[PDB]
Amino acid sequence: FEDIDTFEEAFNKLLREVLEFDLQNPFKDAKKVLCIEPHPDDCVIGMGGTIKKLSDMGVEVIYVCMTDGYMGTTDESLSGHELAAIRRKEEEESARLLGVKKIYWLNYRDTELPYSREVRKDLTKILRKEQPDGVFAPDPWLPYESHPDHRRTGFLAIESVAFSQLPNFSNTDLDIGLNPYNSGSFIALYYTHKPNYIVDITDLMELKLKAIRVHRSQFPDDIWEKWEPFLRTIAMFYGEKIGVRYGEGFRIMPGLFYHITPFTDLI
């Protein structure tokens, strides 16, 4: 469009017409979604109430869990293998409370999630098989996020959603009968410092806290004394943004903005 007079107009036409970007009800049509978590519990803690709301509407929610949570205990007589047996059950129970379908366990070791083509391939296979309408994953640009598994899951999820659409990427998948990942599915990023879409989870907050504490191994009383205020405060930082008590924040952008975009901060 050669004759438009200001950046601001252009950007506006770009968002609303060219890209028809819409934060009003961005999960309106979804039938199936994947929620990707670095560790068992992260989906519920980041977006449990949202997962529930989706379930409630008849959306199929599938988990993909990058690691086994092997490392997450201070108990010197609980091995990582035992912990991981336990966290699997804990996540199955938590997810059942949220109406969640199915979990894909990638089984990478807790704290050792690689950042590699290999991991992109695992996700790409799930993506291609399930062809979901939207994907959720932690925002790897969250500042002071000191857990490598979190930053890497984030990155790998965004990369995989783009690359799994390309037939020459992980090409054996197509050779065993899968199609590339279908275009026009959304990415939504939770655990974000810059959300631009909030789900009100005021009514659901006690459901979320319950489903979080089901991961008992992660949440004994002395830990919960700190974690419950923390989780509640986080939910209020998000909710206030839409004038409600408790929210879950997401960052959702048009696919182009994840690449060469110097004005991403205008959504």
Q: What is the 3-state secondary structure (H, E, C) of 66-93?
A: EECCCCCCCCCCCCHHHHHHHHHHHHHH
Contact 192, 158 (CB under 8 A): no
For residue 203, the one-letter residue type is D
Identified binder of Zn ion from the candidate list 34, 36, 39, 164, rule CB under 5 A:
39
For a copy of itself, which is the closer residue by CB, 55 or 145?
A: 145
Identified binder of Zn ion from the candidate list 15, 34, 35, 42, rule CB under 5 A:
42
CA dihedral 197, 121, 82, 95 (to 10 degrees): 30
Please check if 42 is assigned to a binding site. Answer: yes
Distance CA 46, CA 61 (A): 15
Please check if 56 is assigned to a binding site. Answer: no
Q: Is the dihedral of CA 52, 53, 59, 64 positive or negative?
A: negative
Which region, judged by CB under 5 A, interacts with Zn ion, from 40-48, 68-76, 166-174, 239-247?
40-48
Task: Find the binding residues for a copy of itself in span 101-120 (CB under 8 A).
Answer: 104-107, 109, 111-112, 116-118, 120
Distance CA 97, CA 242 (A): 26
For a copy of itself, which is the closer residue by CB, 99 or 228?
A: 228
* Measured CA distances, 73 to 53, 57, 82 (Å): 31, 36, 11
Which entry of a copy of itself, Zn ion, none binds 88, CB below 5 to 8 A by partner kind? Answer: a copy of itself
Identified binder of a copy of itself from the candidate list 26, 32, 92, 121, rule CB under 8 A:
121
Structure-block tokens of residue 8: 């601001």
Query: With binding defined as CB under 8 A, does residue 168 bind a copy of itself?
Result: yes
Please check if 193 is assigned to a binding site. Answer: no
Query: With binding defined as CB under 8 A, does residue 220 bind a copy of itself?
Result: no
Q: How far is the CB of 111 from a copy of itself (least distance, A)?
A: 6
For a copy of itself, which is the closer residue by CB, 56 or 112?
A: 112
Interface pattern 67-86 for a copy of itself (x via CB under 8 A): -x-xxxxxxx-xxxxxxxx-
Structure-block tokens of residue 225: 């004394």
Query: With binding defined as CB under 8 A, does residue 244 bind a copy of itself?
Result: no
Distance CA 132, CA 60 (A): 9
Instruction: Give the annotated binding-site residues for Zn(2+).
Output: 39, 42, 150
